[PDB]
Design an enzyme around this catalytic site. Structure first.
Site, PDB file in Angstrom:
ATOM      1  N   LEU A 265       0.819  -1.201   0.000  1.00 16.28           N
ATOM      2  CA  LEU A 265       0.000   0.000   0.000  1.00 16.28           C
ATOM      3  C   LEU A 265       0.858   1.258   0.000  1.00 16.28           C
ATOM      4  CD1 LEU A 265      -2.922  -1.114   2.262  1.00 16.28           C
ATOM      5  CD2 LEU A 265      -2.838  -0.817  -0.201  1.00 16.28           C
ATOM      6  N   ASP A 266       0.204   2.369  -0.307  1.00 14.87           N
ATOM      7  CA  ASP A 266       0.813   3.686  -0.325  1.00 14.87           C
ATOM      8  C   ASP A 266       0.771   4.284   1.080  1.00 14.87           C
ATOM      9  OD1 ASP A 266       1.956   6.041  -1.176  1.00 14.87           O
ATOM     10  OD2 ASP A 266       0.300   6.667  -2.460  1.00 14.87           O
ATOM     11  N   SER A 267       1.591   5.318   1.288  1.00 16.26           N
ATOM     12  CA  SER A 267       1.458   6.144   2.482  1.00 16.26           C
ATOM     13  C   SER A 267       0.118   6.873   2.512  1.00 16.26           C
ATOM     14  CB  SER A 267       2.621   7.132   2.553  1.00 16.26           C
ATOM     15  OG  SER A 267       2.637   7.996   1.425  1.00 16.26           O
TER      16      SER A 267
ATOM     17  N   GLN B  74      -2.072   4.328   3.803  1.00 18.52           N
ATOM     18  CA  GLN B  74      -1.822   4.158   5.231  1.00 18.52           C
ATOM     19  C   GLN B  74      -2.518   5.246   6.044  1.00 18.52           C
ATOM     20  OE1 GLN B  74       0.530   6.001   7.429  1.00 18.52           O
ATOM     21  NE2 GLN B  74       0.187   4.573   9.122  1.00 18.52           N
TER      22      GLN B  74
END
Ligand code: CDL
Ligand code: PC1
Ligand code: PC1
Ligand code: PC1
Ligand code: 3PE
Ligand code: 3PE
Lengths: 177, 87, 171, 558, 128, 459, 100
Positions: B41-43, B46
């Site tokens: 996943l991406d920040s 997140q």
């Protein structure tokens, strides 16, 4: 800006915080859940349009006018969580959060009302006082010259020792006394 | 009123939220699945997950802690810290 | 009780109970319950206390101050006589204050007792109140906190000079 | 006679008896909140008998029972005035307080200082019935400052919280600014009329009474949250819910209105005081109702509701209709206490959630709360033949048909529409639609304390206007002849407010995101009035309290 | 484009709309690191005394003691009478005294002139 | 008055012949017995004052100040006995002897029939107070206050001495009873203007006056608790008592010499109350509150109406009790946290609930909550100054906002909010401390039932 | 270095050696009897008997007499047709004004 560990905000942290504050103020603007979820994917698309920007000066400028966009479109009274600072139930029970040392000032007729509790509190305090000088001599040999650079503390290294500066974090009052 | 939170309850609710997320498959999701490295996943994703935790449990995680919660076990441990579970 | 002349109460006119509707009011039943449960035991205890009052009858008296010479016929700087004049004047000052308080009690009781027709039916008490307040103001106003019989005499003399000059300028 | 005065004093002594009980304690209590609720129920029953024997004959009296002081011409006695105002306010206040305490035995059950809470709430009730029964200005000032200080102590109930202490000190500040005018009125009556007693004030009947009535209007501004001295009543929602329900909706905040209703023979012969009351009341009922349109905390919205109703009370005093204003007080107590109780039932059910943007779907989840909230909102707006119809509509039926400031009437009608707007806003965001609260449902209301406490004020909010308005005697002449567009004014304006706000609410389901307008930023930041003056007037004080006062003059030069 | 936010004395500019917050230069790294270092050192010096069990009392804060000594003691010995201090001690020192003096003297002369001309309604005024 | 002076003097062999563990108990017991004896002075009459001898007399002005003075000694012995525990026994007896000598001076200062005996006892009260403040004040830093005491002696008591000797030569007597009947009007002249300033400025500094209050937030700070109690409770009220005696001779020149100083007080209570909103030092805050309350007594004496004298003596008694209790509360925190900083120890209602109840009651009496005699005095002064000028109500009412504002702020800062973490020596309330708060507050609350005994000679 | 000085004495706690300390003295018998003296001669003696003394003061400054005397004099001059109070405190016949 003002943080315990870092002296600044990285650009990645600034982007994530602006995205979060934009979504929170947007949810304040956009009360209904399906409507906010539609505009939330639209705003996620607007944030992922320039996710892959290599130039940090151009990303700095884009972040700056994104802050101007967020300030121009902010809600005046955004939704603050009740126990979040600015909330209606925030720091409400702080008048009930008596510090633990006040148990030391009780009279022995009411200390005898809870015998197992204070009989265990004696060895809690015993643990604290035989941990203290070991964790002080732990901190005095790891701290660099000039004092510690950052506010973060090292953990318990040896087996049997306790982490330094631990008593007020462990024995803090409950959030609902 | 005000029901007690347990690590079984906090664990099952955090995993129940993450199993209703369309970028995390419900068969690879574990209690130690890292968001960037193991679930990919991406920040941004997140931050959306920590905001979903805020939507789930009715309080706010600050950003200095939201920038570091990188597994569901860290989420359960942080809510255990901020809610005083297993008295 | 008290004296019905200094505290006048006009003769009471209550109307008769005229029950028009068939539903029994609660107030007669509550009045009978108050008469039985409350008036009787209090009255019996008061009769016991009054018998014990009768078992030792002893009296007190209203103190009288015979009139000593006033400040006008006392010599200047003669403290033995003008002390007596000052004590007489101060007793009369406090008594005049209580006269004003009696007339105020009359006016307030007249206003409440007459209710909504208080402006029509309390003209005499308001007139007496205006006269006694004019008298008390001419007698004791503007003396100061260090008031005395000398201040009151000098105010009376200034008022008499003003009244004599007003009489002279009218002729 | 011997029944009336006796039970009159028995009510107040009975209210003071649990204060002696809580002060003479050694044990831990066998449910002291139940003891105080039982005591206030029986005090209600006790005060019902003088009210019924007042409705029988019109029997008013004075109990000047204890001589206290005599300052040379001023005999200050302990004097209780039992008139129409006391005989209608005391049973309503005791009934509302009895419902608030049966509410509080549920709502405030988690508080370990529950005995201190019920003690403080009883102290408030004692000071308030000292206020509304006082026959001189001094005993009224005793009750006045008493409800101010118990307001302080019940706003700052969670005294660890900074905002609660801030709001409590704010409320004390605005109330003492009103107390400037109250002491101005006492000073004027003592110097020019030689009295603080009401009877000698009314019997002397002065003509140059502009200055004491300006003092009384400033006192009612400080006390009833009129414009200029208003923002402490929205700030005072930081206290607990039964505090805001009893004190700051229905019982304390009507005391400036009660102070002006109490002095009606001076206002009925001073047109300038009537005009100033009309202008200030219309300004407040416009401004607070406009601020209520764009808020999201439900306690803030119902506080702006009660302050707009206080402004309407000031309006109907300002048209020289004081008895309609007091009927509106006795009416308003029921449904506004019930609206705060139902809002707090939602708040405690939804785990301290007060923001209406995280509510919804509570029509079938909390059915009794939804029923009573709809009944309270419809009594607020002026639904036909609820309790709020029997006063407020008559207010409009005398606000149209009188020699009136025209703009005050038009702003009164705009306020009447805004009441419907924020009422259906509360019903929209809190009861209708789909849920927005978090996922762990702990929604419950099945306690007989909560249900019976809302039930008795529900019986009040249905029947009490009819019962009281058919039990009170005429003190004015009701203006009952007007054209049909003028008779149908308040109902049509209220329904237009409902239609406009339903169109506003159905524009929110649309998938559009508009930039905020200047009207929205004005009404959401509260006319910009608590944002500027709460920053500027402290600043210009405190720097002046440090630079020139302490440092320059009183440490160096002098 | 957009309305620019205007800072004020009682409305400060936000951290986000200030340009100098977006400095990336190494001298700002040095200043921020030295501020973090002083703050961390003072935090450590505090919570070694705070978490000490052998101490039972008040962790004395010399910044607080220094603040109170500045607010009380340092007021006179660093005074210099000049134009600014004398004019500001004459404005707020003998200004409003003269103001309320002439206001109250004017109103009392008016009231005395009305009383000695029989004008002021002093009818029921017997308490004073 | 000799049934009070001789027991107060017998407290000296009682305090020097007592056993070393018994010297607080014996002096507290016998001073409480003297305070019970002090109620025989309530034999007052509506016309005549109670005139004992050629040397001593008592009207209804001096009588409540005497009862408050004789009541203040046991409270000072309770308040000052904790921080003198490690003191030498002989120095402890010297402290008690200076307290007894100060009471001895005061109880024949208030009853002084003749005005130069009033002057001797009036300036005699400064010496045991000076020695108590400078020998037991725990720190002494008085670099600016020496010059101010020189200013007090120059502008104050010495012109009063020359003026009283001048009245002794002119009138032939300084008996106040004789001067009631031999008073001449003091007309407009420059000689009479300097006469008025000489008769008034000593008592103006003793109240204190605004602009002349520079000593009082120093002398209250640098003192022990008994010194601050007797300064707030009695030693300010010597100025008001002396003004109410000496304004008999200053008529009618007072009717135009009061106008500057009235301004100095009417604006002055606006300033000092505001000064209390910016105080770091709690004891200094209570000092500036004492200035802000004695400004009203200055105005009420200078306007010389009956309602103003009644309100001024009620305010003097009430403020004596209230401000003495406020200094005792300030000491009951200072003996724990060892610093007077008001922002240091916060949130104390979480730790000391009954002591926070005492803080609440002393704050409500400080901000004049009715029907307390603080409010009765405040209110009667406000009524009389409205009769003086109808605009002054603004300067009254604005003060009555700010007087509320710092009263609850002192409550909100010290007792409410979050407790300070690094302070762990906050003990529970000793029974001595709660007894001291109750012996302040319960007389102050009982005087609301029967206020007629504290409304002066012209009630 | 600086002079020979005894160190700062620590603040003692009166609850350590005596958990029933009232704070009057460190000797417990002296402390409890100081408590009994303060509470008896303060509250049982001065406050209670003092309020009983003040409550039954024999007409403090003759107010009640002055009401009852007024209840005589009004009754003397309502009945004899006199005004209730003259505008002159003294007899205007025994006063000699300055002539002009
Ligand atoms: C001569 C005989 C006379 C007999 C009648 C008595 C006359 C008055 C006497 C004094 C009254 C106050 C006494 C208690 C207060 C002080 C101690 C205290 O704090 O105790 C707390 C404690 C209860 O609390 P707790 O939970 O146990 O512990 C404390 C908590 O931890 C923490 O506390 P908390 O925060 O939970 O609760 C504190 C609370 C906090 O509450 C407040 O702060 C609210 C108060 C203000 C608003 C409400 C009142 C407004 C004014 C209206 C009422 C007055 C006029 C009424 C008349 C009709 C209308 C005009 O305070 C109270 O509840 C006190 C109630 C009484 C308050 C009186 C007004 C104080 C306000 C300031 C002055 C106002 C003007 C003057 C009033 C004068 C009255 C005569 O009380 C006791 O243990 C009682 C001790 C024994 C009291 C004896 C009283 C008599 C003493 C005189 C002896 C000599 C005469 C013999 C008579 C003997 C009778 C038995
Ligand atoms: C459980 C408690 C109850 C007691 C139980 C045991 C006793 C049984 C019951 C019988 C009692 C005894 C007989 C009745 C009492 C005596 C009657 C009587 O004549 O008493 C003499 C007097 C009556 O007054 P008075 O008019 O005769 O005399 C006043 C005194 N002079 C003239 C000098 C001014 O006193 C009382 O009655 C005292 C009781 C008063 C009740 C109210 C007290 C309120 C206190 C508030 C303080 C602040 C006031 C501020 C407000 C003022 C106004 C604005
Ligand atoms: C306080 C500030 C003023 C203090 C002045 C000094 C004390 C004066 C005491 C009163 C003396 C008196 O009777 O004055 C009238 C007397 C009048 O003189 P006399 O009374 O002898 O004259 C006979 C009477 N007549 C006036 C009718 C002719 O005043 C003086 O003699 C001088 C007074 C001023 C003193 C100047 C020196 C001190 C300056 C201030 C220092 C501080
Ligand atoms: C005085 C100057 C120095 C100041 C400091 C003094 C310190 C030393 C102290 C010495 C002892 C005390 C002296 C002063 C005593 C004053 C008290 C006193 O004597 O009062 C006389 C007053 C006298 O009242 P009275 O004026 O009516 O007296 C009539 C006269 N006789 C008695 C002869 C007929 O006593 C009372 O009022 C007692 C009445 C009965 C008790 C009270 C009943 C009601 C109480 C309140 C009930 C609850 C109300 C609601 C509360 C709600 C919550 C807040
Ligand atoms: C009181 C009488 C109420 C009934 C008479 C008024 C009827 C009316 O005009 O209602 C307007 C409106 C309904 O019309 P609208 O919402 O536009 O269309 C959808 C229909 N469900 O809206 C409503 O009916 C809702 C508002 C009704 C207000 C009732 C309280 C006054
Ligand atoms: C500083 C510390 C803080 C503050 C504390 C107080 C300090 C000052 C104390 C004194 C206050 C001011 C003096 C009192 C003013 C009273 C009225 C007055 O004197 O007015 C000014 C006067 C007007 O003239 P007039 O009063 O008619 O003089 C003839 C008198 N028979 O005008 C004149 O005659 C002209 C001026 C002449 C000089 C007068 C000097 C004597 C007064 C000050 C000493």
């Amino acid at each position: 800006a003002f943080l315990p560990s870092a002296a600044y905000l990285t650009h990645q942290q600034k982007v994530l915080q602006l995205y979060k504050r934009a979504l929170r103020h947007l949810e304040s603007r956009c009360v209904h859940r399906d409507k906010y979820r539609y505009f939330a994917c639209l705003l996620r698309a607007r944030f992922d349009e320039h996710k892959n920007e290599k130039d940090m000066v151009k990303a700095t400028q884009l972040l700056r006018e994104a802050e101007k966009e967020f300030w121009h479109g902010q809600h005046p009274q955004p939704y603050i969580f009740p126990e979040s600072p600015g909330g209606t139930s925030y720091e409400r029970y702080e008048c009930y959060k008596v510090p633990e040392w006040c148990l030391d000032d009780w009279h022995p007729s009411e200390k005898a009302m809870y015998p197992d509790y204070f009989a265990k509190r004696e060895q809690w305090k015993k643990l604290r006082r035989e941990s203290w000088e070991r964790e002080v001599k732990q901190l005095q040999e790891e701290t660099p010259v000039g004092g510690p650079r950052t506010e973060a503390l090292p953990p318990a290294r040896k087996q049997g020792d306790l982490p330094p500066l631990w008593w007020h974090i462990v024995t803090r009052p409950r959030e609902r006394p | 009123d005000a029901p007690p939170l347990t690590l079984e309850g906090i664990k099952d609710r955090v995993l129940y939220v993450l199993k209703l997320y369309d970028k995390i498959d419900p068969e690879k999701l574990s209690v130690n699945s890292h968001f960037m490295k193991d679930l990919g996943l991406d920040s941004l994703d997140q931050v959306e997950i920590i905001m979903a935790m805020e939507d789930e449990f009715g309080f706010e995680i600050p950003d200095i802690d939201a920038e570091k919660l990188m597994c569901p076990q860290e989420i359960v441990d942080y809510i255990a810290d901020k809610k005083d579970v297993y008295e | 009780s008290w004296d019905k002349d200094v505290y006048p109460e006009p003769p009471r006119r209550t109307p008769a109970p005229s029950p028009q509707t068939s539903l029994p009011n609660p107030i007669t039943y509550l009045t009978k319950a108050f008469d039985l449960l409350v008036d009787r035991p209090v009255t019996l205890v008061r009769e016991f206390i009054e018998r014990q009052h009768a078992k030792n009858k002893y009296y007190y008296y209203h103190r009288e101050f015979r009139r000593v010479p006033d400040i006008t016929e006392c010599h200047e700087k003669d403290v033995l006589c003008m002390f007596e004049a000052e004590m007489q004047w101060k007793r009369d000052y406090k008594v005049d204050q209580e006269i004003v308080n009696i007339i105020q009690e009359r006016l307030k009781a007249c206003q409440q007792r007459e209710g909504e027709s208080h402006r029509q039916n309390c003209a005499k008490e308001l007139q007496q109140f205006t006269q006694v307040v004019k008298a008390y103001q001419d007698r004791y106003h503007d003396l100061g906190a260090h008031y005395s019989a000398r201040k009151c005499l000098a105010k009376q003399k200034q008022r008499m000079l003003a009244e004599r000059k007003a009489t002279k300028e009218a002729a | 006679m011997n029944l009336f005065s006796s039970l009159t004093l028995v009510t107040l002594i009975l209210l003071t008896m649990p204060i002696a009980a809580i002060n003479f304690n050694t044990h831990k209590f066998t449910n002291y909140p139940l003891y105080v609720k039982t005591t206030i129920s029986c005090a209600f029953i006790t005060s019902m008998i003088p009210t019924m024997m007042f409705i029988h004959t019109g029997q008013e009296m004075i109990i000047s029972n204890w001589h206290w002081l005599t300052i040379q011409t001023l005999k200050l006695s302990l004097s209780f005035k039992m008139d129409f105002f006391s005989m209608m306010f005391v049973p309503v206040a005791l009934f509302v307080t009895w419902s608030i305490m049966e509410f509080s035995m549920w709502y405030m059950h988690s508080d370990p200082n529950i005995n201190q809470f019920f003690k403080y709430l009883l102290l408030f009730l004692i000071t308030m019935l000292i206020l509304v029964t006082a026959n001189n200005l001094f005993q009224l000032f005793i009750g006045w400052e008493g409800v101010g200080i118990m307001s302080f102590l019940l706003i700052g109930w969670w005294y660890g919280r900074t905002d609660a202490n801030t709001a409590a000190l704010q409320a004390i500040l605005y109330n003492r600014i009103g107390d400037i005018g109250f002491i101005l009125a006492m000073a004027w009556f003592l110097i020019n009329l030689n009295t603080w007693d009401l009877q000698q004030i009314f019997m002397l009947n002065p003509n140059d009474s502009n200055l004491p009535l300006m003092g009384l209007i400033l006192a009612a501004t400080g006390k009833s949250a009129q414009f200029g001295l208003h923002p402490w009543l929205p700030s005072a929602m930081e206290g607990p819910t039964p505090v805001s329900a009893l004190l700051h909706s229905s019982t304390m905040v009507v005391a400036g209105i009660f102070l002006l209703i109490r002095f009606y023979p001076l206002t009925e012969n001073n047109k300038f005081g009537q005009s100033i009351m009309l202008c200030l009341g219309a300004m407040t009922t416009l401004f607070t109702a406009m601020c209520a349109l764009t808020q999201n905390d439900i306690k803030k919205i119902i506080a702006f509701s009660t302050s707009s109703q206080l402004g309407l009370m000031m309006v109907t005093i300002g048209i020289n209709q004081p008895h309609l204003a007091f009927l509106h007080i006795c009416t308003h107590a029921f449904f506004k206490a019930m609206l705060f109780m139902c809002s707090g039932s939602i708040i405690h059910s939804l785990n301290d959630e007060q923001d209406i943007r995280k509510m919804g779907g509570l029509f079938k989840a909390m059915p009794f709360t939804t029923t009573a909230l709809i009944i309270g909102s419809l009594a607020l707006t002026g639904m036909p033949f609820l309790t709020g119809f029997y006063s407020k509509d008559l207010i409009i039926e005398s606000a149209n048909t009188s020699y009136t400031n025209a703009w005050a009437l038009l702003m009164t009608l705009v306020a009447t529409s805004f009441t419907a707007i924020y009422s259906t806003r509360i019903i929209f965001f809190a009861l209708l639609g789909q849920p927005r609260f978090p996922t762990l449902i702990n929604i419950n209301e099945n306690n007989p304390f909560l249900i019976n406490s809302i039930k008795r004020l529900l019986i009040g909010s249905l029947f009490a206007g009819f019962i009281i308005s058919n039990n009170i005697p005429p003190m004015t002449i009701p203006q009952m002849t007007m054209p049909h567009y003028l008779k149908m004014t308040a109902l049509t304006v209220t329904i237009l407010g409902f239609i406009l706000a339903l169109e506003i609410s159905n524009t929110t389901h649309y998938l559009k995101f508009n930039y905020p307008s200047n009207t929205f930023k004005f009404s959401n930041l509260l006319g910009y009035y608590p944002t500027i003056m709460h920053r500027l007037t402290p600043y210009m004080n405190l720097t002046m309290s440090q630079k020139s006062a302490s440092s320059l003059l009183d440490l160096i030069w002098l | 484009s957009f309305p620019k936010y205007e800072p004020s004395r009682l409305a400060s500019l936000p951290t986000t709309l200030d340009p100098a917050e977006y400095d990336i230069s190494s001298e700002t790294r040095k200043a921020q690191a030295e501020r973090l270092a002083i703050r961390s050192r003072l935090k450590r010096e505090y919570q070694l005394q705070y978490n000490d069990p052998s101490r039972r009392g008040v962790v004395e804060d010399p910044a607080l003691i220094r603040w109170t000594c500045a607010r009380s003691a340092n007021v006179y010995p660093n005074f210099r009478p000049n134009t600014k201090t004398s004019l500001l001690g004459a404005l707020f020192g003998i200004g409003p005294l003269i103001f309320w003096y002439y206001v109250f003297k004017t109103d009392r002369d008016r009231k005395e002139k009305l009383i000695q001309e029989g004008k002021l309604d002093r009818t029921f005024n017997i308490s004073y | 008055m000799l049934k009070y002076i001789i027991p107060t003097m017998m407290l000296m062999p009682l305090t020097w012949l007592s056993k070393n563990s018994m010297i607080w108990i014996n002096t507290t017991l016998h001073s409480l017995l003297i305070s019970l004896t002090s109620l025989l002075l309530l034999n007052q009459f509506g016309d005549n004052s109670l005139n004992f001898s050629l040397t001593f007399f008592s009207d209804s002005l001096s009588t409540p100040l005497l009862i408050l003075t004789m009541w203040l000694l046991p409270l000072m012995l309770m308040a000052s006995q904790h921080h003198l525990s490690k003191e030498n026994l002989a120095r402890k007896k010297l402290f008690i002897s200076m307290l007894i000598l100060l009471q001895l001076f005061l109880i024949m200062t208030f009853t002084a029939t003749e005005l130069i005996f009033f002057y001797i006892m009036f300036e005699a009260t400064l010496v045991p107070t000076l020695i108590i403040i400078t020998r037991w004040g725990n720190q002494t830093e008085r670099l600016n206050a020496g010059l101010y005491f020189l200013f007090y002696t120059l502008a104050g008591s010495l012109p009063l001495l020359v003026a009283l000797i001048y009245i002794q030569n002119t009138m032939g007597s300084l008996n106040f009873l004789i001067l009631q009947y031999w008073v001449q009007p003091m007309p407009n002249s420059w000689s009479n203007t300097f006469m008025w300033l000489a008769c008034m400025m000593a008592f103006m500094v003793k109240m204190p006056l605004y602009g002349l209050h520079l000593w009082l937030p120093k002398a209250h700070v640098e003192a022990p608790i008994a010194g601050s109690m007797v300064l707030a409770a009695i030693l300010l009220k010597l100025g008001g008592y002396g003004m109410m005696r000496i304004t008999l001779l200053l008529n009618p020149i007072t009717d135009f010499m009061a106008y500057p100083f009235i301004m100095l007080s009417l604006w002055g209570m606006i300033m000092t109350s505001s000064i209390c909103l910016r105080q770091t030092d709690l004891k200094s805050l209570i000092a500036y509150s004492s200035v802000s309350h004695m400004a009203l007594v200055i105005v009420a004496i200078l306007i010389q109406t009956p309602w103003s004298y009644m309100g001024a003596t009620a305010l003097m008694i009430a403020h004596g009790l209230t401000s003495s209790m406020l200094f005792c509360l300030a000491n009951s925190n200072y003996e724990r946290v060892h610093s007077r900083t008001m922002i240091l120890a916060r949130g104390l209602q979480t730790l000391l609930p009954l002591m926070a109840a005492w803080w609440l009651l002393a704050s409500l009496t400080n901000l004049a909550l009715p029907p307390s005699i603080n409010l009765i005095g405040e209110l009667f002064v406000v009524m009389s100054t409205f009769s003086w000028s109808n605009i002054t109500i603004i300067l009254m009412g604005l003060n009555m906002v700010i007087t509320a504002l710092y009263s609850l702020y002192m409550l909100i800062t010290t007792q409410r909010g979050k407790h300070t973490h690094h302070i762990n020596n906050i003990l529970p309330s000793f029974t001595r401390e709660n007894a001291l708060m109750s012996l302040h507050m319960l007389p102050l609350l009982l005087l609301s039932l029967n206020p007629k005994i504290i409304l002066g000679p012209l009630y | 270095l600086r002079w020979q000085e005894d160190p700062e004495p620590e603040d003692e706690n009166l609850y350590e050696k005596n958990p029933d300390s009232h704070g009057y003295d460190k000797d417990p018998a002296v402390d409890v009897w100081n408590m009994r003296v303060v509470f008896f001669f303060g509250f049982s003696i001065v406050l209670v008997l003092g309020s009983t003394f003040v409550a039954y003061l024999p007409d403090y400054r003759m107010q009640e007499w002055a009401r009852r005397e007024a209840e005589r004099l009004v009754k003397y001059r309502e009945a004899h047709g006199l005004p209730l109070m003259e505008s002159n405190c003294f007899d205007p016949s025994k006063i000699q004004l300055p002539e002009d």
